[PDB]
């Protein structure tokens, strides 16, 4: 295209910048040091790995272009030490340092589109076997998981092993002290409040870890009629409402380190401790993760005494908002259903049910790392486009 065709290339700014004038009349600028650092020749770049061999030690940070020629599709550069580089037009164009170009590329890499939701949620639903068999369906699955935060898959079996198939479709699951996969059932000497018939209030899984699981997979093998309905809420949507309604409570929860703990025996013996802010913000003040399980929050609370009661007051306000009828979405899982969701963004819970002489309710769960998921999503997108 005219946008990707070179009209003129020139060294500017004491030879420290290259400027490309494109055939659409737009101009791009490329620092000489960045071009040299990204030389694609075999000395500098290992093509089989698509990786940089060039060392920092080799890079003159004050380098300027010694000579430059070009045609419509490439630039050819000589360097002061006689090194020689070639750069393709389309490669340069994609990597333009303009804010618009950089932002476009970041969108393509990280899929930031987010659709916030309340009690009006239309639970995205796909077929399990279709997702396993067809790239178009697996793509819709992971893209929707990223954007909405949850997808339900229907028509799995009523036998263990289904979350493992989804894990292989992603790449691999995320092993924790509760196993490769884990069985949510009422257990004698339960090592986790999950493994009882009690109500689970809204929580994220595993804030006792530094790096809580990014994605959760939960498959219904057996369901009870006595209770055990599912509830979910969009934590990012809730945090937005909290900041607006109660900025003091938002400030406390986004700045206060809370200790989490887990001790017991499952896959192996464990004694786990972490610290997190319940509302975890990026450097720009945007919420990126919620870290909260009331069951594993430690008895240890490392704050001065005067900060304690205001913390709990803040926390109450947050949970009250999560529970509001405008925020929460309630549903019942049947055998064969699987939900896959963003464990950093949603909070989830379940209603109490009745104990029995044999197991009346059984879910099999597993976790996946967001990096594993995003990798597969990038591959799938390329395959489908």
Ligand X SMILES: O=C(O)CNC(=O)C(=O)O
Q: Which residues are part of a known binding site for Zn(2+)?
A: 39, 41, 44, 83
337 binds ligand X (CB under 6 A): no
116 binds a second copy (CB under 8 A): no
Q: Which residues are part of a known binding site for Fe cation?
A: 203, 205, 348
378 binds a second copy (CB under 8 A): yes
227 binds a second copy (CB under 8 A): no
Tokens 């700014």 sit at which residue?
13
CB closer to ligand REE out of 117 and 182: 182
Q: Of these partners, ligand X, a second copy, Ni ion, none, which one is at the site of residue 116 (CB under 5 to 8 Å by kind)?
A: none
* Binding-site member from 230, 237, 291, 343 for ligand X (CB under 6 A): 230
Q: Of these partners, Ni ion, ligand REE, ligand X, none, which one is at the site of residue 363 (CB under 5 to 8 Å by kind)?
A: ligand X
Residues 163-222 that bind ligand X (CB under 6 A): 184, 194, 200, 205
- What is the nearest approach in angstroms of Zn ion to the Cβ of residue 77? 10
- Residues found near ligand REE in the complex (CB under 6 A): 178, 182, 184, 192, 194, 205-206, 208, 262, 293, 296, 365
Alpha carbons 118 and 135: distance in angstroms, whole number: 30
**Residues paired with residue 364 on neighbouring β-strands, in sequence order:** 183, 219
DSSP string, 226-242: SS--EEEEEHHHHHHHH
- What is the nearest approach in angstroms of Zn ion to the Cβ of residue 81? 11
Contacts with Zn ion, 35-54, as mask; x by CB under 5 A: ----x-x-xx----------
- Residue 235 CA, chain-centre distance (Å), reads 14
> Do 68 and 11 meet the contact criterion of CB atoms below 8 Å apart?
yes
> Do 186 and 350 meet the contact criterion of CB atoms below 8 Å apart?
no
- What is the nearest approach in angstroms of Zn ion to the Cβ of residue 42? 8
> Do 35 and 120 meet the contact criterion of CB atoms below 8 Å apart?
no
147 binds a second copy (CB under 8 A): no
210 binds a second copy (CB under 8 A): yes
Q: Which long-range contacts (CB under 8 A, 24 or more apart) does 34-39 make?
A: 35/65, 35/77, 35/85, 35/87, 36/60, 36/63, 36/79, 36/83, 36/85, 39/83, 39/85
- What is the nearest approach in angstroms of ligand X to the Cβ of residue 348? 5
> Do 127 and 137 meet the contact criterion of CB atoms below 8 Å apart?
yes
**Residues paired with residue 46 on neighbouring β-strands, in sequence order:** 51
Contacting positions for Zn ion (CB under 5 A): 39, 41, 43-44
């Amino acid at each position: 295209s005219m946008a990707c065709t070179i009209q003129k290339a020139e060294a500017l700014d004491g030879a420290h910048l290259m400027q490309i004038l494109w055939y659409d009349e737009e101009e791009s600028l490329y620092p000489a040091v960045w071009l040299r650092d990204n030389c694609p020749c075999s000395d500098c770049y290992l093509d089989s790995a698509k990786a940089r061999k060039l060392l920092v030690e080799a890079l003159d940070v004050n380098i300027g272009i010694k000579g430059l020629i070009f045609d419509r599709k490439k630039v050819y550069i000589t360097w002061p030490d006689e090194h020689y580089s070639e750069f393709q037009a389309d490669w340069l164009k994609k990597r333009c340092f303009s804010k618009q170009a950089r932002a476009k590329l970041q969108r393509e890499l990280f899929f930031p589109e987010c659709q916030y939701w309340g009690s009006e949620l239309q639970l995205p639903t796909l077929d399990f076997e279709d997702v396993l068999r067809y790239d178009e369906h697996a793509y819709k699955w992971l893209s929707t998981l990223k954007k909405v935060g949850i997808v339900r898959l229907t028509g799995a079996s009523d036998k263990p092993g289904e979350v493992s198939k989804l894990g292989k479709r992603m790449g691999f699951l995320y092993l924790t002290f509760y196993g490769h996969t884990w069985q949510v059932q009422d257990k004698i000497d339960a090592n986790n409040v999950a493994y009882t018939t009690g109500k689970l209030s809204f929580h994220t899984d595993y804030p006792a870890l530094h790096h809580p699981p990014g994605v959760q997979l939960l498959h219904c093998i057996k369901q009870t009629v006595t209770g055990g309905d599912s509830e979910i809420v969009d934590g990012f949507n809730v945090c937005q409402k909290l900041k607006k309604n109660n900025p003091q409570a938002f400030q406390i929860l986004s700045s206060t380190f809370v200790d989490f703990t887990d001790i017991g025996v499952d896959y192996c013996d464990f004694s786990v401790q972490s610290k997190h802010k319940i509302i975890e913000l990026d450097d720009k003040g945007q919420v990126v993760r919620i870290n909260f399980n009331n069951a594993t929050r430690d008895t240890i609370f490392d704050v001065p005494v005067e900060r304690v009661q205001p913390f709990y007051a803040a926390l109450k306000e947050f949970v009250d908002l999560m529970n509001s009828k405008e925020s929460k979405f309630t549903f019942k899982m049947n055998p064969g259903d699987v939900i896959t969701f963003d464990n950093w963004r949603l909070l989830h819970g379940r209603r109490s049910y009745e104990a029995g002489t044999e197991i009346s309710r059984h879910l099999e769960g597993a976790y996946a790392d967001w990096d594993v998921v995003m990798s597969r999503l990038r591959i799938l997108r390329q395959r489908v486009e």
